[model samples]
Target: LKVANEPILAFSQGSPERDALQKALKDLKGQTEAIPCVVGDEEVWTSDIQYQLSPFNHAHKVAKFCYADKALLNRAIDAALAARKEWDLKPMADRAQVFLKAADMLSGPRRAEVLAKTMVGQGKTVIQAEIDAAAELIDFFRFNAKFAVELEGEQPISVPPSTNHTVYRGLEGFVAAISPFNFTAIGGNLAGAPALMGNVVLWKPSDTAMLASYAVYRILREAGLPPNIIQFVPADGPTFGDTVTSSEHLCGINFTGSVPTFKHLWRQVAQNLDRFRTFPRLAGECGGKNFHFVHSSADVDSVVSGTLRSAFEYGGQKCSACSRLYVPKSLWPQIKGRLLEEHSRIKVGDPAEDFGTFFSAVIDAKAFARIKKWLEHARSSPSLSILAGGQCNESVGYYVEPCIIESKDPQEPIMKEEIFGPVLTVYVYPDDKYRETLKLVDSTTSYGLTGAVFAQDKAIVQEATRMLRNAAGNFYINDKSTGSVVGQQPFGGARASGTNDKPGGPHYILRWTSPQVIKETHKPLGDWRYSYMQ
Candidate 1:
């Protein structure tokens, strides 16, 4: 089947999509939705129920969910293991249809519901919600299914008298999908991809994004994915990590989170290496200190526009958000003026009410605290100067104004650290030291996730590309460091960023499977006897 991207609906004034989304938001706000842990065919509940509070307004809760304890986690694992037998035996094409139907459901009927929940529960604007929850999610489903079927068609070459065949088999044990809170599409892809490859998945949705994640699960089920194929178990981070790591049935972990957490999970898996039935696969997109490098020859308009969208959009919670910027001294004055002007124009509020709001809030209190601490650092440090938008107030909500900082020291922590918030730190470099700045960009951060270079000079652009080869996985010439599309960009990095598996690319499907080759010959024994034995 031909795979294509899902078109994003414009929720403009008096538009049909806008009306539907508004109704969906209103309806959801009117109800106290109950989210339960799902295992096999059962909706499991626990006494340890938790509420997913709105990041924009902590007082208002969008959904209440029950966390799965150790026993329930074990039960979910068992459900996945049992389900894997039949799921793996199903033809790849059969699995493809289920997800294709899911794509249809989301792109058609359930589009507004996904967008509304993402906005309320996760603090995403309507456009951000549409891009992530609707378009990206649908694209993942359709593209992944297409990719899986293509993988199944790959076969070994055969000689005249022999027939050779290859079968793409799912991993022996189950996969643990530990997804992040940033994007609803990521949560869907993390769990759904492994299940599509015929591997069972124990999907643990982020506590902050339960509503939209559960919506994805329901969408898959309605699309005809059989029960127990993917057991939705929302649990405490360490508890789930420990339980899955200790189990011999954990064949893979599809993770996206902090560097420390990924390392912790890695350490656990390494310590529990002896217990597994097969060698487990660990795939993670940890985080990034992504940057934007501005050359003197760069266009100031594009730089200001790109940096604003890349740095501040979605509150800069995206892993690839531009947190650091390197500006040539010649362009710094003009660029800084434009940036502040644009910053003032950008609106921040409850995303549901204003269709034009740039961002609402940070994901939750933990995120707010983290970003606030960074802001405090910016305020206290002499080398770090807050150029614009440096206030954070959580009285009404977890709102942090998107700030732009000028760093006198290139090695400032705010410049190097993956703030994961709407805080952009810029270091002005001399026009002559453009080459030196490129080196600093490469050496300054351990992350190799994403970065961008804005330069109109062809020679400088070429030189920068060659010099900063290892700086970023998804490097852009003139564009911002964010907004990596599914088929176009592929999306990932290495050297502490991730495995560089390129999730949206063609090759990511290979990570979820183990291949077996089969060969049958018409004239087998005669060949060995004729040449050697004679």
Candidate 2:
């Protein structure tokens, strides 16, 4: 976990067909060109240049594109169901082996391609981009597949223990996985989770990380995923929900991304509950404003690196990145100096640059315009200080410089809201201000995704952890909020952040399974109901 603060200086691969493309890709720079959306056969541009739709690439685009068609979804679901039955019949070892194979393919040759797509699409640094694009997905696959074959549940005895025995098993049916853009691995998260249990999956991924998403689907297919067992559909979010929510054959959905859309999806699923072809599984991880806290004894380097990485990685577009920071007044001077210096060291350049850039163009104009308005508002407000990066340029693409602000009141909208950009807010406190800082962190937002406190004392750590109830998934001690390993730590937040969907853990795999007990009688009675009644 070495976090480098030194600015990376390099250029983009230059173009798609050059030495840059031929060489092994080490930088986390994304693709340079924005791929246009196929909106009902008509091209749709995001109305900006810096942040291209390149994140929506050939490898990942199929997932988003799949959402557009009913025939495709129905076809995929039908195929998946047929495949699931066959998969269920296979030995657990065989199923686990195939899933592991998919991850291996992704990590080897296909990794560079997907990472490049993610960097281009999302404007993340090479390390950050690669982590999202390859590492996490690989982790999810290996962990879940291993968990699936190794998963064990308790056996319960019958009411009259001598008469019968009952054993529980997780069974799979037709299932669906919906993923978002912020993280490239999200598409595979739940899709892989359900597949672990021999369940078939139809995936609908976000357009931003389309190439990466599609690549995973292809890899799994190549790994001998039963035909139609794992399907990928590309389309809009609404249409995907509309098609799936009303169907009885749809057994499960692993959703990651936004809440507004998730709310609508949940409601739609409810509307179709009467169909009851089978019980449905719904697990989701939504939006949240993650945080970072600085204690007096915290390592200045660790604190700065994690905080900056979380705030600026992919321009703070990740669901788990920290949008808020709480700093003690005593450490403010040193921390601020180091942070501002590191901020200066970063070279914001083209996403295709070899050195890796920070704060490239985001998805489209609406997001860029909204960010611009917020920055402008901050600039005009008397209560905030624009520490670094609030400049907007009209030259190349949608780019916003990394901005840091200090606010007297943590309740300020700028401090409280999830401003999904390379904007960081520092909330400072004095010797007598730890409690106040705690209150501010707690009250600042409605989100509880990921948060960290830089404290040296175990007692302080315990107290702080106990006090902060909102942070649902991860709590970092003297580190950043961006990264989480697959098997070790569970990911996802509380409240609006999710429906307890923690991807890459045992629980995640369990969420998709509908536990069943298939009972066999010692003797068959001709009329059991009447015999019992008599």
Candidate 3:
């Protein structure tokens, strides 16, 4: 598995591995029970009980969990601070062993359980679960260890008589990791990445993915991570932020969530600036209004399929999901017809009951309501026409059909806002207005997360590439922008999308540690003499 990049163990036709996963899930269904938050090896239970239900089937409760209060959150922070000294002093290789062991365990013994939990808790398809919890997590663990070694080896140039080296130490206090529900891999990495650099973490996993997030911590603990090094505390954002940001020991945050929530956390840190020992590190990856543009020279089938997959995969909950598209006037007729046909054939149902389901329900009632509101707005707009599907119902499940809205105006509200649902809006531009269309795409959203261009013509591709260079952090040429592979394309974006720090790159680990320069002089001169004085 360490031969270059970790290979993605994909499931396909007649594959024996698929049956193994199905069997594991079947076993898991009967074993449904409580999942508790942990702080220093102790399972902390609260009076308030929260049930984590499947998005695909609301009637089925996957697991029950307890929420933390102000006192418990403070206790979690104290536990992390208690473990910081020893964890920071531990050798880099010893620290690497915990993560490496975790990667192997996930790949070998724990693959099916992790996959099953992710699928059930987060409502991911088999392939989606495999890619995120299995492959991407493995890559983050293995590559981050190597990246740490590289970070430690960065030394200053020394003169002949003196030897100079740089030491990478963990931040003074602990990291507060606030993770999202979209990817199980990210939920682990938010805490695990910083912990790999010798910092302790107090993680607050998304309520929707509580069960799967607990599984991640369990794997790390089983792989020899010390109990106090990373504490899992499930709590409401406002309460958690108010408690954590007010702490004098709070050192940093590793976060991925909505723009408003992230901004609120940032503001709290600012308001409580005088209470901290040092300025906390604020590393975040937030929302996006991602896009795809098709030129006249693009292949019809490629544009249709790529747009369809990126727009509707995982109910389009990904921050990098393509929600807006700009196509040429010449090819609009064929692209529109083919896209509608493909969208019509897409199966929307309970993924737990059907393996072939191409679409499923949104995460919960809140998201369902929000997406339906946007769909209604699009329906009411005079400049927009519903091309394919715009129907939404939440009686059985919070299912919203993959919708396509063709907008005559490029500046339509649906074209700019981050819907974060399975809704894609199209704007057909005049062939001569290609340059103007490029400008519109770049200026439409404050986010610079992900975007793609579909053009067979090299010149057109180059033009779009140059024009929209700052439009997306991970840019795709003739491909979907959603599936960002670790190591291959380190993901993040600038401006409103959060920090531009690429997660899988060589420099990302630096954000978690403070560098100390060590200068060793072979001999000290006893006499103080200066050539200038002589």
Number of clashes recorded per candidate: 0, 34, 0
Model 3 stretches astray by more than 4 angstroms: 1-3
Tell me the RMSD of model 1 versus the true structure: 1.2
State model 2's lDDT. Answer: 0.68
Residues 1-534 of candidate 2: C-alpha lDDT, one tens digit per residue: 111111211334564323443353334333233334332223334322222254312232222232346655565566666656767667666777776887777666676666666666565556666566677877777777666655643445655223443222335557767887778777777677677676777677666666666667667767877666666666666777888877678777778867887788778888888984876777878877878987797888889888888888777777877877888888999988999999998766665554445556665455678888889888887788889888866355567788888877777888767777778888788858897788777766887788888889888888888888665467777778877777666787787787766776666776766666655556555654665577
Candidate 3 residue lDDT tens string, 217-299: 99999999998999989988888888889999999999999888888889999999999999999998998899899989998
Identify the candidate with maximal lDDT: 1
**Candidate 2 Cα outliers beyond 4 Å, as residue runs:** 1-52, 55-67, 152-173, 356-359, 519-534
Q: Worst lDDT window (10 residues) for model 2?
A: 1-10
| TM-score for each model | 0.98, 0.83, 0.98
Tens digit per residue, CA lDDT, model 1, 1-534: 798898888777899999999999897774568989999879989998899988888888888998899999998888788889889999999999999999999998999999998999999999899999999889889999999998877887999799999888999999999999999999999999999999999999999999999999999998999999999999999999999999998999999888899889999999999998888999998789998999888988899999999999999999999999999888888998999988899888989777778898999999999999999999899999899998988987899998999999999888778888899998999999877889999999889999999999999899999988998999999999998889888889988898788988888989999998999988746543566556
- 326 in model 2: Cα distance from truth in Å? 1.3
lDDT for every model?
A: 0.91, 0.68, 0.88
lDDT of 2 at 501: 66
